[PDB]
Amino acid sequence: LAAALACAL
What we know:
By secondary structure, the protein is mostly helical. Helix content is 78%, strand content 0%. The chain contains 1 helix and no strands. It is classed as de novo protein. The entry lists the keywords DE novo protein.
């Protein structure tokens, strides 16, 4: 989930 956010932004 941390990575999900980083990628998205």
